[PDB]
Amino acid sequence: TGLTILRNANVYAPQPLGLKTVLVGGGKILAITDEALELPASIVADDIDLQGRILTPGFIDAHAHITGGGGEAGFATQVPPVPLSQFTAFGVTTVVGLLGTDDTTRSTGNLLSRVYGLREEGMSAYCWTGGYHYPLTTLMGSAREDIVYMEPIIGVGEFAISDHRSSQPQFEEVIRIASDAHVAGLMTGKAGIVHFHLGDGSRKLALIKRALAETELPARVFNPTHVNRNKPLFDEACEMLSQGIYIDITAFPDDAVDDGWSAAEALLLAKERGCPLKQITISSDGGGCMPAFAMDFGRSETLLATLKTVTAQGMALEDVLSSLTANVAHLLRLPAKGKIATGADADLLVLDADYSINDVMALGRWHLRDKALIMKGTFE
Amino acid sequence: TGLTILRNANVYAPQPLGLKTVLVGGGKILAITDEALELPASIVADDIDLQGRILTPGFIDAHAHITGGGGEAGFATQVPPVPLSQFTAFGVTTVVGLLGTDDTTRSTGNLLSRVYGLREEGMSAYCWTGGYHYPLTTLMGSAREDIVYMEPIIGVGEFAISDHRSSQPQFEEVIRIASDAHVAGLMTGKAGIVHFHLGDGSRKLALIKRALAETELPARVFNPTHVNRNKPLFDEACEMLSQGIYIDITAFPDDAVDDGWSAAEALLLAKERGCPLKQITISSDGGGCMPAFDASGAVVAMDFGRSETLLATLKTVTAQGMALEDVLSSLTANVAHLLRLPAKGKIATGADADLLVLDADYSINDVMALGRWHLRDKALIMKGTFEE
Amino acid sequence: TGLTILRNANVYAPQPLGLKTVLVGGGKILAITDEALELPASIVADDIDLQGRILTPGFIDAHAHITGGGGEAGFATQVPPVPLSQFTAFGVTTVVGLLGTDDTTRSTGNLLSRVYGLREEGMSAYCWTGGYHYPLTTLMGSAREDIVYMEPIIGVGEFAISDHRSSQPQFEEVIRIASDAHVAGLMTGKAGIVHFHLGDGSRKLALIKRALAETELPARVFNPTHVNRNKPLFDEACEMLSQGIYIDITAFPDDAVDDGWSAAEALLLAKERGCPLKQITISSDGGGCMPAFAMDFGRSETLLATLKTVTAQGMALEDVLSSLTANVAHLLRLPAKGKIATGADADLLVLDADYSINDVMALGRWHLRDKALIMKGTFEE
Amino acid sequence: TGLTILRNANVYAPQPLGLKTVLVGGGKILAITDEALELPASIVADDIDLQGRILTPGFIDAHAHITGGGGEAGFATQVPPVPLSQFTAFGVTTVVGLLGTDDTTRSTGNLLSRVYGLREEGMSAYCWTGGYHYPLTTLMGSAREDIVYMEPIIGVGEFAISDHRSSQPQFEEVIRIASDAHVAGLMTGKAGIVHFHLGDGSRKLALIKRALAETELPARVFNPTHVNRNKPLFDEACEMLSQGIYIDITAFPDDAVDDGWSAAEALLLAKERGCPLKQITISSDGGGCMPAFAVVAMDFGRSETLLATLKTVTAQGMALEDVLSSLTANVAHLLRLPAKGKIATGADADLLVLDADYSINDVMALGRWHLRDKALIMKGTFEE
Ligand SMILES: [Zn+2]
Ligand SMILES: [Zn+2]
Ligand SMILES: [Zn+2]
Ligand SMILES: [Zn+2]
Ligand SMILES: [Zn+2]
Ligand SMILES: [Zn+2]
Ligand SMILES: [Zn+2]
Ligand SMILES: [Zn+2]
């Protein structure tokens, strides 16, 4: 009902702004000021002194199996849907859902209905249409119709290249899909991009290199993920940043890194190479199936773990925080997200000085307060 | 994006609350209080003393051809899409769009894309899927899929019964459509109703009477409109209020009333009969094709329906002694209740900041949609992309 | 891969057979004997003295939302898939999955793929095609194709009648669906029936009465469930048992009973009225959305709770056990299930004297042993 | 029923294990032991002394027209469905059915329904979806859906390349089909491979060579059959074994060999060249149309050529386990049938008892005798 006032917030917007008073109401950031705002008590829901603790935008996890992934090694490996608290307790206030390898038994209707479920439970959610294989799995007859007509659908993903599980897509198929995503993006104001799953194939980003050389499509339309899964792929991804693509680094748990880089190592290496960090995002692959050589699934907890690892190695908080917030909102054309700015959505984290999460606000409501869950999923 | 404070508002919520201070921010009503709120000037965009002038919710016009209607007497009669200001200048802050007789050349994609256009221009908009004829015109393969998956699609309409332009729908077809709308409504929290176009056919509401007698579908699922177009239909509509249906009265211009009641006469008559007015709504049929006649009855000119008839209706019934809150509810809270729009139709904390400021004669002075002024001292501050 | 021998089992098959030795191997019941079998130690995996404890068939829960149900009051009410142990720990060794009210966002491919997941994890699973609404939700173009070509698909359900959430199906639509299920059943040897969701509509079982009066379709094809949800419906369901239909009673938790009967009350009342109990089954509606006036979901735990309630009120164990085992296997044409008989699947419960479950065997493997889970779902912790 | 005990079995599993007692029950192999098991008579259905006769796994014939093939030279050449005994009497306890050249009048529904018919009659049966031509003949809208949702459907076949009767498939079409079979295989635990019909076209295995060089698809996904039909094709198939493909040799009758190798000659030649025999399978093309020569008379392929091949190569000095593996364990390994192709505890009780000359004396399928002392105990519903 009322206003929420956050006093002495050490604001990372994600760029450091210093101490501010932050006023929240109607699910929005209404003011960011040096002034010690004096308000009538009758209209204030919560008056909180953060006493110089860090305030950041909520994380945007743009690669999550919100329905659960798996199904790649038997039907029993179908992962259950990710409960609300497995996003919010880890600082994820916006998720972008996708289908992966199983786009056969799982449908775009499964995915979009779970987006609406997470929205009803008080977080923000979008999704990718099309999935992994060709022809694309869509709700309507085509990806272009899905993106034009369904507000939460922002692009095509995660479409597999250079992977034994791909549909062995041809150049002509890839640039047609990209053209449909791009046109739908222009018509709607949404991301109009193709989120590509990369495997360990030695062709790496060859299809995207050819698209950038031969077509007029803007480079931002080609968005490869898991680029840290092997070192030659990561090198090729870093080189292609100069052509204007955005690259997505996956926060693998330490077990699953194999012959590649952790998200932490990859981001530190991109910084050391002088890569444009504003073109680099990190995602968790939450709900993705995680085999042990027992069976588990990916968690959004690796995003904060990554942030702690790189900051402990001397990276500035704002550099890694941007890869989880403003950079994702910029690529995905989410102007209300990824920023502490007046008029933006009140999706906010309060961090301790070691960057542990103390509080999580989504759309102006506390989900986590003093490390305790206040709001949880319907069935948690 | 500061706060807006409206001081000394005579609040019709739509029920009269007396004088209040109303605080708006983030597109929402943040407070309604007796307190003379003192706020820091640095966070206040607008501090307005209404000095006891009436504040109401914005009107919800649940029957409008947002794409334009017509096409019923030649292709030249296709009405252009209704510009933003032809809603907002008349106090309409939420519209529900539909296709009418022409659901052949016009598509659900035309309709839904215009909903998104009106939302981008700063008003609120929803639509009906299915249209007028059988089989239904939908975006996906079925009405149930449209209502489940497309947030702005709230139900089926305007589906024609008792009209020479209908598809002569059978009872079994009607209750199947109603079942699909109802189930989709339960799944989504949306209206989940069938908005029925009534014509002058003497069968009147017989298909709805049969549905209420023979099925378990709740009465609110069957929502007839234009019930004032002839007197026997209006009498049957009033009688069926006791079974729990909502009825929609159309604010025809005075020319187009023919052998029926104006919206004003129909609402006054429902009140005189002791009908439950909370089950009665008024809509404009804006963007509907409006033929103009000479003294000889020859078709001379063509115009389209306007949302201006809603306020004209409110002025007419209040001049005849109806309480402002009774007619205002028929444009606001009753529509929001039937259509399950909990953010709309009410001056209540947490609701959308869709507000009208009225003069003493109930002329609109100011119109706010989602916390932004569209009309201020009778001047347009915000207009459609292509308005001049 | 040895033999398992269960000595001194007090066998309810589900009919009481007395004390027996039961031999299990290759997932099957190989012998039921008075003999104290002496076997070479080298081929015996497990030699267990049950010391006179009750041995029953595993329960067949023929009405479960294995994918999760809900979605009837907002997308947030989509129930997660039921984990393996939420069947096996409650004595359910065979489940028949279905879609309910949400047969729009959920597909037959969702349902059938979860059947295969539960089979991979070591229980037995089947499903109903078609769902709740008309037209039917199927994997192939028609229910008849689904039942003919997909081994686990046994019939059509749960198809809604006398309910505000139904598709307001017409008699002609219902008997066409029934004819397709019946023909597919004859071609395949499978159930070939229509499992009908009943609501609180006052028309009750009128469409089924009309089908029995006007068509040649056998009565067993028309299988109404939730018949205990209101008392006039339950009375009509009991009267129609004399025409040869089977009725399914839902084991609602005590909160959700409203103006109807608990499964326990309904089964005791059917027995008191002299109804043919072999035509009565009980199911849990596991994974179904359960509102509090908070949100929870249905559990297979109500089946054993029902068995304890009716036995405490004087019903013979074999009467209620048949409603969970042999009666379901008979109606659904599952000849390997619902019975302790040689050649049948080794799906077995060991009960304490108060009928608490001590051990659960599915296809010859222990899932529960001395009330500890030995086998669990892929993602259970 | 209770337990069956087979005493003094000379076990080829298919590798030689020596003399064993084999215990069967519930359709499974429950024990393989040196112990002379003593069991209570009340639980024993059958106590059989094999007297040192050879015991092998049942043959897996992974290329059979279970519906009948033919239709390539007029409608009258449609072969009738193969009766149960025309598998079991020849030692075939598992068959994998397919459509061939006529995937126009014959459907995947014909094929899958005959799989279920053979299962009802007590043998094991699977099938290939898609058939010979492009676009594919499937039950559902796609091969990937067929393999994901229909338990008996294990892959795509028999898809024609280098043949005048092919659909002239392009590289891009072939690798798309292979990707769909592979992904469906991973999702289900099933074979997930493309079984390719090879003709006499001089392009031979060019499309598969290109797939192995240009894609990440595992080599095992590309499974060419009839590789013995001409000598240059057979040489190319043998060379590609080093890239990890499995190759299927067809047991043509002696008449039909033309300018190629018999299965026997092909397997002996692969052994002489030091090829990895575990990557080589033999299939009969049972139910395939067999014209007799001017075209004078018409017959159909029989599973009898599998055992004839085994007798031919063993008479030329090949070890029984080498050729037996090509009919049993190698097929079960490629097709991901862990219950088949092996005498191992927990496996299906699909067993052959052979005489000293390797003639079949007894055939057990899923623990039941189909053939006992060379007499049929079980036959098809309509066999007389
Ligand atoms: Zn991926
Ligand atoms: Zn992934
Ligand atoms: Zn109308
Ligand atoms: Zn109209
Ligand atoms: Zn149910
Ligand atoms: Zn139900
Ligand atoms: Zn062939
Ligand atoms: Zn061939």
Numbering used by the authors:
A (entry chain D): 2 to 294, 302 to 388
B (entry chain C): 2 to 389
C (entry chain E): 2 to 294, 302 to 389
D (entry chain F): 2 to 294, 299 to 389
Authors' account:
Cyanophycin is a bacterial biopolymer used for storage of fixed nitrogen. First, cyanophycinase breaks down the backbone peptide bonds, releasing β-Asp-Arg dipeptides. Then, these dipeptides are broken down into free Asp and Arg by enzymes with isoaspartyl dipeptidase activity. Two bacterial enzymes are known to have significant β-aspartyl dipeptidase activity: isoaspartyl dipeptidase (IadA), a bacterial zinc metallopeptidase; and isoaspartyl aminopeptidase (IaaA, also called plant-type asparaginase, EcAIII and IadC), a common Ntn-family enzyme with known plant and animal homologs.
LmIadA has 44% sequence identity to E. coli IadA (EcIadA32). Like EcIadA, the purified enzyme forms octamers in solution. We examined the activity of LmIadA towards several β-aspartyl dipeptides and found that it displayed no apparent preference towards β-Asp-Arg/Lys. To confirm the structural basis for this lack of specificity, we solved the structure of the wild type enzyme at 1.8 Å resolution and compared it to that of EcIadA32. The crystal structure of LmIadA shows a homooctameric architecture as the asymmetric unit. Two Zn2+ ions are liganded by H64, H66, H198, H227 and E159, corresponding to EcIadA H68, H70, H201, H230 and carboxylated K162. Substrate binding residues in EcIadA such as E77, T106 and R23332, are also present at corresponding positions in LmIadA (E73, T102 and R230) and display similar conformations. The loop formed by LmIadA T251-Y262 is longer and bulkier than the corresponding one of EcIadA (S255-V261), and as a result could restrict access to the active site. However, the partially flexible region between G288-G306 (EcIadA G288-G303) is oriented away from the binding pocket. This leads to a similarly sized opening in the active site region surrounding the non-Asp portion of the substrate and explains the lack of specificity.
